[PDB]
C-alpha cells in the first residue's frame, strides 16, 4: 500500500480530504492551528496514488505527501 | 602560406571555379533574348558574380584545394599574416552589439522593476523608456564597466533563491 | 496470494497483477532494496555476480576461439592475410533456400557460412597462433578457466569461504594487490609471452609447450639483463624488408623502441609492445608499494586525504572525510570505475585505428570500422552508466553531516552555476554549429560555394605540426630539423614515427579541414550537452525548487503527479533517461564522421569529404545515400547474395526504432483503459472464459514504458548502424 | 484575401498569357523572387520568355477552364 | 582433436532452438506462478 | 488613440514592427553591399 | 449512532444495463454497494457509463471498486443533496460499511477521531536516506 | 506583540519553502502558541498559484 503522510504545516483547510476521491483522508481535532483541525490517513488500504490530495494542498511547502509503495488491487484501481 | 594554404589570388581551383559559375550562367543566359527582362537578370547575376570573385580575391583570403577561401581564427596569425578581418575585427562588432542588446534589456528590467505592475511593462512595451535606454546603450562597455567595479552589476548570495540541497 | 517470485521482495510477491514479473525482473540485481540485506550480504553477493560474469566471459572467449578452430579458416587465412576473408562460423538455419546456401558460401568454405568483422584472426596471429590446435587449446584452457571462476562464485557464498566486512574494505591492501599484482605481474607476463611465443613466432620459429623449455628467446641467453647491458637487447632488430611469419629479413632483437609500424603489417612492431608491457610493468609493480597494509611502511589514503586542504579555504574543508564517503559507498566506486573505464574504451578506439597494433588489421577495413563503432558505443553507455551511478550515490548514499565544508558538498553548494554554463556552453556551441552548417547548406544550394564559411582548424593543425607533420608549414618542434625536441629523438624513435606520421597512405594524424573543425565542434556539441542532462540530474537529485524531498522518493519513481503544474520526468532516472538519447546521438556523430573520414581515404579520394563535409546535404546525400546503394539491395526481385542478411538486419533496426516510439509518446492510461475492455472480452466469450489468467493484466507502468522505448530506440540504433557500417564497408571493399 | 492574393499573383507577376499559348511545353508559374543574397537562382527558366517559381496549385489550368485569356480579368 | 561430429550443427541448433527454450520457458512459467504456503 | 498606442504597445506588435525594422536593415544593406564575407 | 445494516431487498434504480457492470473480481474477490435514499424520482449519470433514474426512498447499486462508489456518493451529493452510504461486500457474505466511517462526512472534524500517519515535524525536517538504508525492506524517510 | 511589524518586510529562511531567501510583506502574526503564526504574502506565485504562507517565529528573518 502506498504511504500517506500529514505533516505539522497543516492548516486544517480541509481541501484535501474533498479531493480524494476514495475517502482516504479525514479530519480530527488538534491544537496547532487557528482551525484546530488537522488532516488524518486512516485508510491508506483504498488510496491509489493519485496525489489530488497533494495538489489541492496550500501550504509550501505540502502538508500531506504520497509515496508510491506496494501495489495491490486496491492500489491498482481495478475493477477486475 | 599558413596551414599549407595559398591564397585565393593565385588558386587554380578558385579561378576554375568563377569559370565553372560563369560557364552555367551564360549557358542558361543563351536561351533568351538580348532585351528582356530574364537577360538582363541573367547579366546582372553574372556581373555579382564577378564583382565577388573579383573582392574575395583583392581582401587576400586564403583558400584551399577545392578553390574555396578559408578563415584564419587564431588571433596571432590574423594580426601577423593580415588575417584580421576574417574573425577578430567581427567577432569585437558582434561582442558591441551583444552587450548593447543585453544592457538594454537589462536596464529596461531594472528600470520597470521598481515600479507598481512590472509584469505589464513587460507584456505591453514601453516605447518611450525602451527607446530612451535603447538610444543611452551606446556606452554600453564604459558603464558596465562602471558598475562592475561599484560592485553594483551582481546580487548578493542571500538575495538569490537556491534549492535545499 | 502471494507468489514465491520474487524471494527478495515480498511487497513484489504480493502483487497480483502482471507488474510483479517486469519488476522482480528488473530490480533482482539492485541487492541494496532487497528484503533483509545487510552490508556484509552485499559485499557477499556481489563478490559471487563478478565471479560468475567472469566465468560468461572467459567461456565467450573460449566458445570464439572454438568456433574459429572448428569452422573458421586460420590455417588458410594466415597464409594469405591480405586475399582471403576471415570466418566466424558456419550456418545452419533450415529456412534457407538453395540461393541463400550458395549466397553465403564463400571464404573457401564447404558450405554456408558468416565472414567475421570482430578482427579476432589478426590479434591471434599477432600474438602466435598458427594452427588450429592452438585455438583448440586455448579454446579448452579458458572453458576449465571459466569453470573453476563458477565454482569459485558458488564456493564463496558457503560458511567457513564468506569474506568479513573488514575484508571488503580493505582499501590499501586491495589497492596495492591490483597494482603490483593485477597490472605489473600481468603485464609482466604478457612480456615474457611476447618474447618467448610472438617475437620467436613472427621469425618464422615454431614455439610452444613442447619446445619452450630448450628454445632461447636471445643469443646472449640472459647474461646482459643480469650484468645491466641491456643495450644489447635492443641490438639487430627487423630489417625493413621482413616478411611477417617468415625468417626473411628477421632480426635477433627482443626489446626495441624503433616507432612508426611494420612495412608490411602496417601494424606496431612486437619489440616495441614488449618493451612497452616490460616498462609499464616495472612502473606498475614500484607503484603497487605506495599503502600501508601489515609491515608499517607505506601510506593511508585517509591521511593523504585529510592533509589536502589549502590554506586559503578556497576548497572549504578540502578533502576531509572523503575517505569515509568513498569507502562506506558502492555507488561512489562503481562510478568512478565506470567513468575511468568509459574514457579507456574511448582512449582504446582512437588508438587502435590510428595505431594499429595487430598485423594486417590496416588493410581489413571492415574491421576498423566495426571496432571502432563498437568500442566508442560501449564507451558511451558505460559514462551514462558512471553520471547516472553517481546520482544514485547522491539519493542514497550521500551524508551531508557527515561530507560539511569539503568539496563533496561544495559541489551541491553551487550546483546551479555548474548547471548554468553548461547550459550556456551547450547553447553556443548549438547555435554556432547548426548556424555555420545551415549558412554552408543555402551557400551550395545558391550555387556559391566560395560564400560558405570554412574556419581553418589552426589549433589542431599546430599541434600536428608539433608532433611531426609537415603538411602545414609551422616547423617547430618535431618539424624542425635544429630543434632539441627533434635531435634528441633521432637515436631512439623518431624516424619511424616520423615516417609514419607523415605517410598520408594511413589513420596516423590524419589531414583536416573545415569539416574536420565544423564536425569537431558538433562532437564537442554532444559531449557539453550530455555532461549537462547527466550532471544536472546527479545534482538535482536530492532536491530542488520544485521538489525539495526527491532525496525522500528515491533514485527512481515515476513523478510527483500533475500538481504544481506537472511533474513529468522530475526523478534522477529520467535525466539518465533523456542523456541516453544524446548519448547515441554524439557518438552517431562521432561514428558518422570515422565512416566517412576512413571511407574517402580508403577509396583513395579525401577531397570529396573535405569539400562535402562542410554542409549537411554531403553528409545526407554523399554519405548516407551514395554508402547504401548496395545494403538495400541485398535482396530484390531479380535474386539476392550475401548482403541480403545486412538489408534484413537494416530493416529490423528500423523496426525497433519504430517500435519504441511507440512507448516513447503514447503513455499508459490509454493502454490501461484498452486492457480493460479487453479483460472484458475475455470474461464474456464463450469457450474462452474457462482459460483464466492468474495475473491480472494491466497496463506497463511509466518508469517501466521509459526503459521499454529507450531499449528499442538503443537496439535498433545499434542494429541499423551496425549493419549500415559493415554492409557498405564489406560491398565497397 | 487569399484568392484576391492568387489572382493578383496570377495578373501581374505570371505567365499565364505565355502558358495559354503553348499549355503543353511551358510550365506554370505564378511568383518571382527579388535578386537578393543569391536567391535569383529560384527563378527558374519555366518556359515563354519568363523566370520564376513553377507553381502547383493548378490556378493556370482552372483559370483556362473558366475562359480567361488575359491578365486584365485576373 | 575436439573437433564435433559433422551432423552436430543439425542437431544442437534445433535443440538450442526450440528443445532448450520450451523447457527452460516452461519451467520458468511453472517457477513463476508458484504459490507460498 | 491612447489604447490604440497601448495596443500597439504590446509584446506581438513590437516585435513585428522590430522585426521587420531589422530584417529590412540587414536585407538593404545586402543590398547595396552584396556579397559580403570579411570586413 | 449506529452502524447501518445492508437490506439486500432494496429496490435498485431503473437502468437497461451496460457493459461496465460488475466481473469475475464482484464473484471471486470483493465489490461494493451504495445505499441511498431519493426524496424523488431523477435522471442520474451512472459512473459506468448511462443514465439511470433514481426511485423515490431506497436506492441500491452494485460497483466493482470504492471510487465509483465514492464518484457517485459525490454526484449524488453536490447535485441533488442527499446523504448516501456503501458497504464492501466480499464473495462469503460479510458486509463491511465503509464511508461515512463515523456516520459523519470527513471534510468537517468530529469527536472521536484519532488522527493516524501524521508526522509532528515538516518535510524540510526528515533525515537523509543514508540513515534508514539496510533496513528490513525499502523504507523510505518519510515513513519514520 | 511577539513577531514582526504588520505590513512590514522579512525574508524566508524555510529551505524547503519555494521563497527561500525571498522578501514578503507580513499579514498577520497569530497570538497563540500556534507553530507558525507568521503569515506571509508574496507577490510572486509558486508553482501551485499560491501567494500566502505560513512561517514561524524564527523562520523570518527581517530584512
Ligand atoms: C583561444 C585559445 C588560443 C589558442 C588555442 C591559441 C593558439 C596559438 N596561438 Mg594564440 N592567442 C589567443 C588565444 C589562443 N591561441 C588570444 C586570446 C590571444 C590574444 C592575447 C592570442 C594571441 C596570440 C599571439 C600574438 C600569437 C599567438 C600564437 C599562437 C600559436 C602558437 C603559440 C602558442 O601556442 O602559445 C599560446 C599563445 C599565447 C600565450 C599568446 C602569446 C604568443 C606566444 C608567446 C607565442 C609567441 C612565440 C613565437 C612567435 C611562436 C612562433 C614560433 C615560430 C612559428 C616562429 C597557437 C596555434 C603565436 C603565433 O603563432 O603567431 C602567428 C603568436 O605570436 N596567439
Ligand atoms: C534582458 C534580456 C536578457 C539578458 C540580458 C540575458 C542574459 C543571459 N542569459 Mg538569457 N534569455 C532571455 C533574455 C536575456 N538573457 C530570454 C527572453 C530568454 C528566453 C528565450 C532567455 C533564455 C536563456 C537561456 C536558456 C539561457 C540564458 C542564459 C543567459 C546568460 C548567458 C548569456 C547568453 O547570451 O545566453 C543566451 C541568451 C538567449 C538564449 C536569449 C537572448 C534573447 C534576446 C537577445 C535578449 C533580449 C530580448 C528582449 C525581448 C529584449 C528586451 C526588450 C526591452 C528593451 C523592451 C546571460 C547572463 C544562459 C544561462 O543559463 O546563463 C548562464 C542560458 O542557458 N538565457
Ligand atoms: C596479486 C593478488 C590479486 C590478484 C591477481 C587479484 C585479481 C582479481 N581480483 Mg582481487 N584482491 C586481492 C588481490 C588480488 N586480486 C586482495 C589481496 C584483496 C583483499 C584486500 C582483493 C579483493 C578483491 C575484491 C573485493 C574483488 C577482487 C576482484 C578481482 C578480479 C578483478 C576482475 C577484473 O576486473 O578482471 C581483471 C582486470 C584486469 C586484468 C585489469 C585490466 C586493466 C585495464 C582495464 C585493461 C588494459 C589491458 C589491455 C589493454 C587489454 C587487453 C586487450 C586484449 C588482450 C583483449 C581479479 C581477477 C573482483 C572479483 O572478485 O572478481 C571475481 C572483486 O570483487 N579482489
Ligand atoms: C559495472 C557496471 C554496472 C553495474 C554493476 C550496475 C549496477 C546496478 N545498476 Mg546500473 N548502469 C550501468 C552500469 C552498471 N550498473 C550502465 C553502463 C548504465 C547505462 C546504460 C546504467 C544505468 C543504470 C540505471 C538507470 C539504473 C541502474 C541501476 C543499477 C542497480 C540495480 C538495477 C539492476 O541492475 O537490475 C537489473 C538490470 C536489468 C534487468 C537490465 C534491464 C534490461 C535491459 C534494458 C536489457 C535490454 C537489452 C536487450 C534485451 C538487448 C537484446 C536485443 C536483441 C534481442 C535484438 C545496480 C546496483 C538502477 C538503480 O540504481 O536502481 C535504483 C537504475 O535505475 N543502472
Ligand atoms: C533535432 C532534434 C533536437 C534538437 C534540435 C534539440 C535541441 C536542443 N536540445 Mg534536445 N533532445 C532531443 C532532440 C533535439 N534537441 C531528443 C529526442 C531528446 C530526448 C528526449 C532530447 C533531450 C534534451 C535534453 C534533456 C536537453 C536537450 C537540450 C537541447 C538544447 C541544447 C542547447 C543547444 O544546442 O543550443 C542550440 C539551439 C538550437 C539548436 C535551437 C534551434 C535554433 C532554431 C532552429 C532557430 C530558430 C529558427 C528561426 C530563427 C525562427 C523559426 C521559428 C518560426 C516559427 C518563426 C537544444 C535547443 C538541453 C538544454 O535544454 O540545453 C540548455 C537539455 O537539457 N535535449
Ligand atoms: C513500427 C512501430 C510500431 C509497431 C510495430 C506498432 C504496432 C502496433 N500498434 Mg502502435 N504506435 C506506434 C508504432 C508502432 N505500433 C507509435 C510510434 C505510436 C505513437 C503515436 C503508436 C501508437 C499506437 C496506438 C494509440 C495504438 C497502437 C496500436 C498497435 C497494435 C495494432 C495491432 C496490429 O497492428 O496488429 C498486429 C501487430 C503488428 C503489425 C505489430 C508487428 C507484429 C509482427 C509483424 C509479427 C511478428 C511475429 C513474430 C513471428 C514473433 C516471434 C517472436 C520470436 C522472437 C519468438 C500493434 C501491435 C493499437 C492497439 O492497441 O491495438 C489495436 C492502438 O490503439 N499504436
Ligand atoms: C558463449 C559462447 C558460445 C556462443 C555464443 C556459441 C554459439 C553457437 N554455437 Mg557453440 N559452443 C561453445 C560456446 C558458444 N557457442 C563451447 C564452449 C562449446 C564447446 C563445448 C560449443 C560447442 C558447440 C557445438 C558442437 C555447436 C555449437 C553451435 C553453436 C551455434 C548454434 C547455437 C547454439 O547455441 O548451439 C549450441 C551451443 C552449445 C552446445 C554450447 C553450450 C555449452 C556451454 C558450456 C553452456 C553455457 C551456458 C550458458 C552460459 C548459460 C546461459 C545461456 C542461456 C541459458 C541464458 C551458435 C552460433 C552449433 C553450430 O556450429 O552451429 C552451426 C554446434 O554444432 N557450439
Ligand atoms: C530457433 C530454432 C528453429 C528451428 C531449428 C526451426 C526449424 C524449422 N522451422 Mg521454424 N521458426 C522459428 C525457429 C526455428 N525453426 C522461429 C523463432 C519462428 C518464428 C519466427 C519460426 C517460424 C517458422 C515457420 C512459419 C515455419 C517454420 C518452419 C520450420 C521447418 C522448416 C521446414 C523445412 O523446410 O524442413 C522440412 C520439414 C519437416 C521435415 C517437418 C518436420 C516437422 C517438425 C518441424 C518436427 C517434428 C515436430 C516435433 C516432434 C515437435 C517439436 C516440438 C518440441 C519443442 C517439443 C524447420 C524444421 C516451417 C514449417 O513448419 O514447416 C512446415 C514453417 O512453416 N518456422
Ligand atoms: C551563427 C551562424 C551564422 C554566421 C556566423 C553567419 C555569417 C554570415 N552570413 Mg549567414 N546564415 C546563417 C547563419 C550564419 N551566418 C543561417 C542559419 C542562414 C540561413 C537562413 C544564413 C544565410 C545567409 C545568407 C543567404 C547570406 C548569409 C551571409 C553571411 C555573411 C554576411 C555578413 C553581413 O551580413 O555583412 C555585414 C553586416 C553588418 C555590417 C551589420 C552590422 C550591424 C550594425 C549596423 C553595425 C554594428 C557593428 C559594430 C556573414 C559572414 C551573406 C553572405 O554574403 O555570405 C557571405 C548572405 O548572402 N547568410
Ligand atoms: C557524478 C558523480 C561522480 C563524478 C563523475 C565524473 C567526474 C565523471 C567524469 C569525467 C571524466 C571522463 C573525466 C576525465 C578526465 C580527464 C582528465 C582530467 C585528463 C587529462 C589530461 C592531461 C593532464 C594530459 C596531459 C598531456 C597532454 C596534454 C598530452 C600529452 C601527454 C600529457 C600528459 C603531457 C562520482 C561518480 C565521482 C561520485 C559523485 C557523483
Ligand atoms: S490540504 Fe494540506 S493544509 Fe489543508 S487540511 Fe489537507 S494536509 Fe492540511
Ligand atoms: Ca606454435
Known amino acids: 500500500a502506498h504511504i500517506v503522510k500529514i505533516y505539522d504545516t497543516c492548516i486544517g483547510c480541509t481541501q484535501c480530504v474533498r479531493a480524494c476521491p476514495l475517502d482516504v483522508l479525514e479530519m480530527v481535532p488538534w491544537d496547532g492551528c487557528k482551525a484546530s483541525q488537522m488532516a488524518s490517513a486512516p485508510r491508506t488500504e483504498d488510496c491509489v496514488g493519485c496525489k489530488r490530495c497533494e495538489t489541492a494542498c496550500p501550504t509550501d511547502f505540502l502538508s500531506v505527501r504520497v509515496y508510491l509503495g506496494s501495489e495491490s488491487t486496491r492500489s491498482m484501481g481495478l475493477s477486475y | ?165 | 496470494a502471494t507468489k514465491l517470485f520474487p524471494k527478495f521482495s515480498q511487497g513484489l510477491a504480493q502483487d497480483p497483477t502482471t507488474r510483479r514479473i517486469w519488476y522482480g525482473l528488473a530490480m533482482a540485481h539492485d541487492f541494496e532494496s532487497h528484503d533483509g540485506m545487510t552490508e556484509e550480504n552485499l559485499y557477499q553477493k556481489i563478490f559471487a555476480s563478478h565471479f560468475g560474469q567472469l566465468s560468461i566471459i572467459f567461456l565467450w572467449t573460449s566458445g570464439n576461439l572454438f568456433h574459429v578452430a572448428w569452422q573458421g579458416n586460420f590455417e588458410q587465412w594466415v597464409t594469405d592475410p591480405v586475399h582471403i576473408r576471415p570466418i566466424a562460423h558456419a550456418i545452419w538455419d533450415p529456412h534457407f533456400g538453395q540461393p541463400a546456401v550458395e549466397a553465403f558460401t564463400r571464404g573457401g568454405a564447404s558450405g554456408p557460412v558468416n565472414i567475421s568483422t570482430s578482427g579476432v584472426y589478426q590479434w591471434w596471429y599477432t600474438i602466435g597462433m598458427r594452427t588450429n590446435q592452438d585455438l583448440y587449446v586455448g579454446s579448452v584452457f579458458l572453458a576449465l578457466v571459466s569453470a573453476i571462476f563458477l565454482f569459485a562464485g558458488w564456493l564463496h557464498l558457503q560458511p567457513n569461504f564468506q569474506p568479513s566486512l573488514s575484508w571488503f574494505k580493505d582499501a590499501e591492501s586491495r589497492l596495492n594487490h591490483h597494482l603490483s599484482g593485477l597490472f605489473g605481474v600481468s603485464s609482466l607476463a604478457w612480456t615474457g609471452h611476447l618474447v618467448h611465443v610472438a617475437i620467436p613466432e613472427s621469425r618464422g620459429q615454431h614455439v610452444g609447450w613442447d619446445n619452450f623449455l630448450s628454445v632461447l628467446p636471445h643469443p646472449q641467453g640472459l647474461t646482459p639483463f643480469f650484468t645491466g647491458n641491456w643495450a644489447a637487447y635492443a641490438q639487430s632488430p627487423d630489417t625493413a624488408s621482413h616478411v611477417f611469419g617468415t625468417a626473411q629479413g628477421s632480426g635477433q632483437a627482443i626489446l626495441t623502441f624503433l616507432g612508426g609500424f611494420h612495412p608490411q603489417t602496417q601494424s606496431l612492431w612486437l619489440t616495441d609492445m614488449a618493451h612497452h608491457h616490460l616498462a609499464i610493468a616495472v612502473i606498475f609493480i614500484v607503484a603497487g608499494h605506495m599503502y600501508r597494509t601489515n609491515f608499517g611502511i607505506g601510506h593511508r589514503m585517509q591521511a593523504i586525504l585529510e592533509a589536502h586542504t589549502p590554506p586559503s579555504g578556497s576548497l572549504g574543508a578540502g578533502h576531509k572525510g572523503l575517505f569515509d564517503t568513498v569507502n562506506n559507498s558502492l555507488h561512489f566506486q562503481l562510478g568512478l570505475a565506470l567513468a575511468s573505464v568509459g574514457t579507456i574504451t574511448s582512449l582504446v578506439a582512437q588508438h587502435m585505428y590510428s595505431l594499429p597494433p595487430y598485423a594486417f588489421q590496416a588493410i581489413d577495413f571492415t574491421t576498423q570500422a566495426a571496432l571502432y563503432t563498437h568500442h566508442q558505443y560501449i564507451a558511451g553507455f558505460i559514462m551514462c552508466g558512471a553520471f547516472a551511478h553517481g546520482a544514485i550515490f547522491f539519493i542514497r548514499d550521500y551524508d551531508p553531516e557527515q561530507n560539511k565544508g569539503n568539496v563533496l558538498a561544495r559541489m551541491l553548494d553551487h550546483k546551479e552555476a555548474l548547471i548554468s554554463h553548461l547550459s550556456w556552453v551547450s547553447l553556443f556551441l548549438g547555435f554556432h554549429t547548426l548556424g555555420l552548417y545551415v549558412h554552408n547548406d543555402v551557400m551550395q544550394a545558391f550555387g556559391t560555394p566560395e560564400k560558405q564559411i570554412l574556419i581553418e582548424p589552426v589549433f589542431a593543425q599546430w599541434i600536428q605540426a608539433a608532433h611531426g607533420k609537415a603538411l602545414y608549414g609551422f616547423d617547430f618542434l618535431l618539424s624542425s630539423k635544429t630543434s632539441a625536441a627533434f635531435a634528441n629523438g633521432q637515436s631512439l624513435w623518431l624516424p619511424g614515427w616520423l615516417d609514419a606520421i607523415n605517410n598520408n597512405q594511413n589513420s596516423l594524424f590524419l589531414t583536416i579541414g573545415p569539416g574536420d573543425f565544423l564536425v569537431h565542434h558538433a562532437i564537442a556539441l554532444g559531449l557539453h550537452t550530455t555532461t549537462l542532462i547527466l550532471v544536472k540530474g546527479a545534482l538535482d537529485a536530492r532536491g530542488s525548487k520544485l521538489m525539495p524531498d526527491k532525496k525522500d522518493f528515491g533514485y527512481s519513481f515515476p513523478c510527483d503527479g500533475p500538481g504544481r503544474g506537472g511533474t513529468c520526468d522530475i526523478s534522477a532516472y529520467d535525466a539518465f533517461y533523456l542523456a541516453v538519447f544524446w548519448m547515441l546521438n554524439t557518438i552517431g556523430w562521432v561514428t558518422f564522421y570515422w565512416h566517412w573520414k576512413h571511407l574517402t581515404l580508403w577509396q583513395g579520394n579525401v577531397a570529396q569529404f573535405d569539400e562535402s563535409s562542410t554542409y549537411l546535404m554531403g553528409w545526407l546525400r554523399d554519405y548516407l545515400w551514395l554508402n547504401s546503394s548496395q545494403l538495400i539491395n541485398g535482396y530484390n526481385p531479380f535474386g539476392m547474395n550475401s548482403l541480403s542478411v545486412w538489408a534484413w538486419t537494416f530493416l529490423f533496426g528500423h523496426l525497433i526504432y519504430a517500435t519504441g516510439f511507440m512507448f516513447l509518446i503514447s503513455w499508459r492510461g490509454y493502454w490501461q483503459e484498452l486492457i480493460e475492455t479487453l479483460v472484458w472480452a475475455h470474461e464474456k466469450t464463450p469457450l474462452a472464459n474457462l482459460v483464466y489468467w492468474k495475473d491480472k493484466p494491466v497496463a506497463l507502468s511509466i518508469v517501466q514504458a521509459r526503459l521499454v522505448g529507450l531499449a528499442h530506440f538503443s537496439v535498433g540504433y545499434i542494429f541499423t548502424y551496425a549493419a549500415f557500417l559493415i554492409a557498405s564497408t564489406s560491398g565497397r571493399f | ?74 | ?37 | ?39 | ?144 | ?63
Open chain 4, 1 to 74: 484575401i487569399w484568392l484576391s492574393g492568387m489572382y493578383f499573383h496570377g495578373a501581374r507577376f505570371s505567365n499565364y498569357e505565355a502558358w495559354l499559348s503553348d499549355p503543353t511545353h511551358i510550365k506554370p508559374s505564378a511568383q518571382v523572387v527579388w535578386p537578393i543574397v543569391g536567391q535569383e537562382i529560384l527563378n527558374g527558366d519555366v518556359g515563354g520568355g519568363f523566370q520564376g517559381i513553377q507553381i502547383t496549385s493548378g490556378f493556370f489550368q482552372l483559370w483556362r477552364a473558366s475562359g480567361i485569356t488575359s491578365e486584365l480579368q485576373l
Open chain 6, 1 to 39: 488613440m491612447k489604447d490604440f498606442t497601448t495596443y500597439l504597445s504590446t509584446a506581438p506588435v513590437i516585435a513585428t514592427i522590430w522585426f521587420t525594422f531589422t530584417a529590412g536593415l540587414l536585407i538593404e544593406i545586402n543590398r547595396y553591399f552584396p556579397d559580403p564575407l570579411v570586413f
Open chain 7, 1 to 144: 449512532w449506529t452502524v447501518p445494516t445492508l437490506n439486500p431487498d432494496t429496490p435498485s434504480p431503473i437502468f437497461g444495463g451496460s457493459t461496465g457492470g460488475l466481473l469475475r473480481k464482484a464473484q471471486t474477490e470483493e465489490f461494493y454497494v451504495i445505499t441511498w435514499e431519493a426524496k424523488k424520482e431523477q435522471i442520474f449519470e451512472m459512473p459506468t457509463g448511462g443514465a439511470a433514474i433514481m426511485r423515490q426512498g431506497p436506492n441500491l447499486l452494485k460497483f466493482g471498486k470504492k471510487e465509483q462508489c465514492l464518484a457517485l456518493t459525490t454526484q449524488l451529493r453536490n447535485k441533488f443533496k442527499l446523504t448516501p452510504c456503501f458497504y464492501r461486500v466480499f464473495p462469503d457474505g460479510k458486509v463491511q460499511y465503509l464511508h461515512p466511517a463515523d456516520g459523519v462526512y470527513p471534510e468537517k472534524v468530529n469527536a472521536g477521531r484519532v488522527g493516524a500517519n501524521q508526522n509532528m515535524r515538516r518535510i524540510g525536517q526528515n533525515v537523509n536516506p543514508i540513515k534508514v538504508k539496510f533496513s528490513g525492506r525499502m523504507m523510505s524517510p518519510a515513513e519514520i
Open chain 5, 1 to 37: 582433436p575436439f573437433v564435433p561430429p559433422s551432423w552436430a550443427p543439425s542437431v544442437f541448433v534445433p535443440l538450442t532452438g526450440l528443445v532448450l527454450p520450451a523447457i527452460a520457458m516452461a519451467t520458468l512459467f511453472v517457477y513463476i506462478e508458484k504459490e507460498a504456503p
Open chain 2, 1 to 165: 602560406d599558413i596551414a599549407g594554404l595559398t591564397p585565393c589570388s593565385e588558386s587554380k581551383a578558385y579561378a576554375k571555379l568563377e569559370k565553372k559559375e560563369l560557364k552555367t550562367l551564360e549557358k542558361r543566359l543563351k536561351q533568351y533574348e538580348a532585351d528582356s527582362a530574364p537577360a538582363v537578370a541573367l547579366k546582372a547575376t553574372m556581373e555579382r558574380t564577378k564583382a565577388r570573385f573579383a573582392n574575395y580575391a583583392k581582401a587576400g583570403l586564403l583558400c584551399g584545394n577545392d578553390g574555396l577561401p578559408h578563415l584564419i581564427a587564431d588571433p596571432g596569425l590574423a594580426l601577423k599574416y593580415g588575417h584580421a578581418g576574417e574573425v577578430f575585427i567581427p567577432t569585437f562588432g558582434f561582442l558591441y552589439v551583444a552587450g548593447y542588446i543585453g544592457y538594454v534589456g537589462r536596464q529596461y528590467l531594472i528600470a520597470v522593476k521598481g515600479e507598481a505592475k512590472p509584469t505589464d511593462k513587460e507584456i505591453i512595451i514601453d516605447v518611450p523608456l525602451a527607446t530612451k535606454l535603447a538610444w543611452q546603450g551606446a556606452g554600453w562597455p564604459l558603464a558596465a564597466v562602471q558598475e562592475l567595479q561599484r560592485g553594483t552589476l551582481l546580487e548578493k548570495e542571500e538575495n538569490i533563491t537556491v534549492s535545499p540541497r
Open chain 8, 1 to 63: 506583540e511577539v513577531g514582526p511589524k504588520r505590513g512590514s518586510l522579512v525574508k524566508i529562511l524555510r529551505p524547503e519553502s519555494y521563497w527561500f531567501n525571498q522578501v514578503g510583506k507580513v499579514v498577520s502574526v497569530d497570538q497563540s502558541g500556534v507553530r507558525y503564526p507568521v503569515v506571509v504574502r508574496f507577490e510572486n506565485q509558486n508553482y501551485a498559484g499560491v501567494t500566502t504562507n505560513n512561517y514561524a517565529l524564527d523562520e523570518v528573518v527581517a530584512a
